[PDB]
Amino acid sequence: FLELERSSGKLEWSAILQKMASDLGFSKILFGLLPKDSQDYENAFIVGNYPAAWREHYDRAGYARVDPTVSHCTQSVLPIFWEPSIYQTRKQHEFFEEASAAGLVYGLTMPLHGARGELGALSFSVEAENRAEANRFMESVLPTLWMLKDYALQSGAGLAFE
Amino acid sequence: FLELERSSGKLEWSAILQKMASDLGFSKILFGLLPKDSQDYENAFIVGNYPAAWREHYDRAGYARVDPTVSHCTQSVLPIFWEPSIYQTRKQHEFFEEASAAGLVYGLTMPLHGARGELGALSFSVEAENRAEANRFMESVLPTLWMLKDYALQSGAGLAFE
């Protein structure tokens, strides 16, 4: 946890975060951050190992307005699991189809709301065989994730905000 | 935690928040929240069972501007433990000495930063003989408190202001 805070720069910070996520049994992560009052989602600060094709397509298609995890983040400080039922609109249906093709089926997103108005998300995706297995897994590590997201946010904003 | 989310009104929500903190070892607590950019701390939505003399005295001589925990809250999302490591100035000396007289020797403060810009603090005080035991009491449930502060924040911001 405290290693995040000590890491000099983005690159080593990112590596620490990815490894910590890997330890817990997640295969993909995204840490994404925007400053206060900003809605420039396509130029957010992004770290992690999401597929670059997904990231580019997402930004090009403006999926930040479509991704149900992102609207949720703008509205809440509580985690959102990537349950089928968060994908409610036709476009979110297609979003899910496309996210699945990129390996992003099971996971959750922890909203980030930093001390200086930063808005963001920390998503963790797990490769699982079914929704029963995935959810039960995420539920096991959730208290750890909960502390992790705020440490990530404070240190991560700290390399971004300054 | 969901029993908090379902709370209809402030009084009802307050009782369950007080009960839960109490169940966790914290006989004194303060949930205080401001809307976006409200620096008038005496305007803040306030629940908990801090001694009323302390609160009114606090909200009148601008102890919010002296309290090291509030300074921290405007800069961090991470918890701050109440200790001389944070009370070090002379103006912060007597703050602690006075907080001590009111029974607030040991505790911690979870900064609050809600999704719509809300600013505030959830503070838990614990009764203990010494700081070693005090820290044990707090660190043992810190993951639970971490979840509780965000649950309190989301539900709370929706009752205070909505």
Ligand SMILES: CCCCCCCC(=O)CC(=O)N[C@H]1CCOC1=O
């Ligand atoms: C506020 C920061 C800007 C947003 C960066 C992109 C946010 C996300 O990509 C959220 C996220 O992890 N969504 C997941 C949900 C299934 O597919 C995804 O890509």
Ligand SMILES: CCCCCCCC(=O)CC(=O)N[C@H]1CCOC1=O
């Ligand atoms: C943003 C909220 C506006 C003012 C709310 C008061 C917050 C606090 O009272 C912080 C707090 O709990 N300080 C602790 C430290 C020892 O005595 C106290 O009263």
